[PDB]
Amino acid sequence: KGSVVIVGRINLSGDTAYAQQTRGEEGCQETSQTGRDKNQVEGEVQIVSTATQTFLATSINGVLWTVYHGAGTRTIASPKGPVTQMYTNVDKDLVGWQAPQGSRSLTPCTCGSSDLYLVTRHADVIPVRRRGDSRGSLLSPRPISYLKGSSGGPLLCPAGHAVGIFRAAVSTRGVAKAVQFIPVESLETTM
């Protein structure tokens, strides 16, 4: 199987969040096969792809994290070739690689706030009220299509710290009313 490939990023650096593509589909396929990706990486949230799926990955504390259901055990492409996972936990649906040079990491949240914000692959910033250790409700439910492809993205607190990694959606008749996430403390213990 090929490597996971960074194909874009969610730009959160200014006042407006927006998605940027950094590699098209043909270059993605080539880079997945070689594992050699010379592109410059920037930012906290990467858009990533395999031959068959596309999703997100988020840097927290120097590790680029994503979901096992997207990445499996795959290496990630890098300027020096394929990079093997540093963390794999199928029970948490969690994998991680060393964060690429040029990326910026989020800091784990320590404030205990329940007012969260989910960042999607389309750079929507979606308010979510935390409802448990691993769940939160959308303030404005929407069709699940709007969340598809955003696993591996972050939930952030009002100060912009990482609270969790988006894992699964709670859906009724195709409407997403809530999200399920890997809490950052689960990452912190993994580290």
Ligand X SMILES: CC[C@@H]1[C@@H]2CN(C(=O)[C@H](C(C)(C)C)NC(=O)O[C@@H]3C[C@H]3CCCCC(F)(F)c3nc4ccc(OC)cc4nc3O2)[C@@H]1C(=O)N[C@]1(C(=O)NS(=O)(=O)C2(C)CC2)C[C@H]1C(F)F
165 binds ligand X (CB under 6 A): no
Q: What is the 3-state secondary structure (H, E, C) of the chain?
A: CCCEEEEEEEECCCCCCEEEECCCHHHHHHHHHHCECCCCCCECEEEEECCCCEEEEEEECCEEEEEHHHHCCCCECECCCCECCCEEEHHHCEEEEECCCCECCECECCCCCCEEEEECCCCCEEEEEECCCCEEEEEEEEEHHHCCCCCCCEEECCCCCEEEEEEEEEEECCEEEEEEEEEHHHHHHHC
111 binds Zn ion (CB under 5 A): yes
What binding mask, one character per residue, do residues 134-163 give for Zn ion by CB under 5 A, x or -? -----------------------x-x-x--
Q: 69 vs 161, which CB is nearer to ligand X?
A: 69
Catalytic residue flag (residue 122)? no
162 binds ligand X (CB under 6 A): no
Catalytic residue among 49, 59, 93, 103: 93
Q: 37 vs 93, which CB is nearer to ligand X?
A: 93
Catalytic residue flag (residue 91)? no
Strands 5-11 and 45-49: antiparallel
Q: Any known ligand binding at 109?
A: yes
Among 79, 144, 161, 190, interactor with ligand X by CB under 6 A: 144
Residue 37 touches which member of Zn ion, ligand X, none, C-beta under 5-8 Å by kind: none
Catalytic residue flag (residue 69)? yes
Residue 51 touches which member of Zn ion, ligand X, none, C-beta under 5-8 Å by kind: none
Q: 19 vs 36, which CB is nearer to ligand X?
A: 19
Residue list, annotated binding site: 109, 111, 157
